[model samples]
Target: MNISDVAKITGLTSKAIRFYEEKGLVTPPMRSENGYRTYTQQHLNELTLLRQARQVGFNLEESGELVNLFNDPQRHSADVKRRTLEKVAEIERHIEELQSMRDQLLALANA
Candidate 1:
């Protein structure tokens, strides 16, 4: 399949796919004889994983790390567990900060 096919199948924009290619996050697809980029099912799968990670709170670099970890055959579950816990802690801190801001706004609104 070509880039358009992968983009439609994976729900990622063509630019995003290109950016991933540029960032070396995903494997660069082979160029066809006609100069068109050719993608495979594996590319689609990787893009899907990237999309899912982005939907959460992961940045591009973080998603790349997750992808690398996922593709490592000798990866340890403990590593993934530790990273996940760290993200959860970060999210909790953000939530606490938002709650404090909300409380301050409410008090100001009443006064």
Candidate 2:
């Protein structure tokens, strides 16, 4: 399929697909007869995973790590769990910071 078809199938923009390609996340695509980039089923799967990773709040670099982990047959489930826990801790830290700011704003409003 062409880039447009892949983009439609994956629910990502053509530019995002191109960016993923440039980031070395997916393999370079084949060229059409007219020299347009042609995507394949493998690219479709990668793009789908990319979207899912983004939904999980993974940064692009972290998404690549996840993809690599998913591709590894010998990957341990516990290791993935540990990584998620680490992310949770980081999120909690940010949440606390935001909550503190909110409390300060509330105090200012009351004053």
Candidate 3:
């Protein structure tokens, strides 16, 4: 498949795919003789995982780490779980801070 096909299949824009390629998140795909990028199913899978990782608030570096962990057959599930839990804790902290701000605003409004 070409980059367009892979982009649509993975629900990512072609620019995003290119960015990922540039960032080394996915290996640069083989190019056609005419200079078009030719992608494979393996690229599709990688992009899909990257999209999911981003949706879960993983930055590019963290996404890269997740990809590395995924490709490592000897990688432990515990490592992934630990990282996910850490992110969850961070999010929870943010939520609490936001809630405190909201309460302060409410108090001012009621004053």
Candidate 4:
């Protein structure tokens, strides 16, 4: 499929998809004889996984690693779980800091 077709189905803008491709997050899409980019279901799957990875707080570099692992048949669930739990801890700390800031602001405002 062409970029526009992929964009409509994925809800990702053409530029964003191209950016992901440029950043090497997904595999190199095939270029047809006419020099146009083409995509298939495999590309769709990788793009989808990349979106979810970013949504779940993985940075671009980390997301690339995750995407690479998706194609690895030897990838282990244990390491994936470990990374997720680590992210959970990071978010927890961020939330704690935000709560403290809120309390401080409330106290100052009331005073």
> Quick one: best lDDT, which candidate?
1
State the local distance difference test value for candidate 1. Answer: 0.83
Clashes (candidate 2): 0
**What TM-score goes with each of the models?**
0.68, 0.62, 0.66, 0.64
Query: Model 4, range 1-111, lDDT digits (tens) per residue?
Result: 988888787767899899999887788789999988999998988888777777767788877776776686656778766766776687688779989999999999999
Better of 2 and 4 by lDDT: 4
Report lDDT (CA) for all predictions. 0.83, 0.80, 0.82, 0.81
Query: Predicted candidate 3: what Cα RMSD to the true structure?
Result: 4.3
| Candidate 2 lDDT over residue span 1-111, tens digit each | 888888888888999989988999876899988999987777788788887778757799877766666566666788776776776687688679989999999999999
Tell how far residue 31 is off in model 4, in angstroms. 1.1
RMSD (Å) of each candidate, 1 decimal = 4.0, 4.6, 4.3, 4.2
Please give the lDDT score for candidate 2: 0.80
- Clashes per candidate (backbone, < 3 Å): 0, 0, 0, 0
Candidate 4, residue 32: Cα displacement in angstroms equals 1.4
| Runs in model 2 lying further than 4 Å from the true structure | 72-111
Q: Cα miss at 7, model 1 (Å)? A: 0.7
Q: How would the candidate models be sorted by TM-score, starting from the highest?
A: 1, 3, 4, 2
